[PDB]
Amino acid sequence: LQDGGWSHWSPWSSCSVTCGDGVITRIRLCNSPSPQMNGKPCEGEARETKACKKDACPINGGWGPWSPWDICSVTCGGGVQKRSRLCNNPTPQFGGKDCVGDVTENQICNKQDCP
Numbered sequence: 001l002q003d004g005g006w007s008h009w010s011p012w013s014s015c016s017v018t019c020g021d022g023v024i025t026r027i028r029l030c031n032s033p034s035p036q037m038n039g040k041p042c043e044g045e046a047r048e049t050k051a052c053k054k055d056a057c058p059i060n061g062g063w064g065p066w067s068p069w070d071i072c073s074v075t076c077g078g079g080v081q082k083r084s085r086l087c088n089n090p091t092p093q094f095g096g097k098d099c100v101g102d103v104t105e106n107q108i109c110n111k112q113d114c115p
Contacts, residue, residue, distance in 0.1 A: 005032045007030075010027045011026065015052035018054060021051065022054075023052060024050050027047040056093075062089040063101065064086045067083045076115075077114040078110065080107070080109065083105050085103060087099030
């Protein structure tokens with residue numbers, strides 16, 4: 001009957017994130033020696049963690065909602081109308097990408113002919 005004993009600690013791993021908060025981790029084994037018949041087990045944590053902090057992860061631009069369509073440029077005979085949006089939802093931050101698309105849309109309106 002031999003009591004367990006811990007190996008030395010493994011090296012610490014790298015930070016689990018390249019941005020934001022995460023942990024570095026290191027482990028050990030009760031192999032030195034392994035507990036024998038009716039031997040005492042190793043005591044304490046077989047692994048440890050720490051805090052690793054990195055700069056904020058990029059926040060990519062989301063589009064906010066479209067504005068209501070503007071009133072047609074004409075009441076009759078084929079006008080145009082316009083609406084628009086912002087890339088603020090969220091705003092690109094910490095190097096995040098720009099929104100992809102048009103800030104503005106146009107379309108025909110009242111295409112029927114006028115009396």
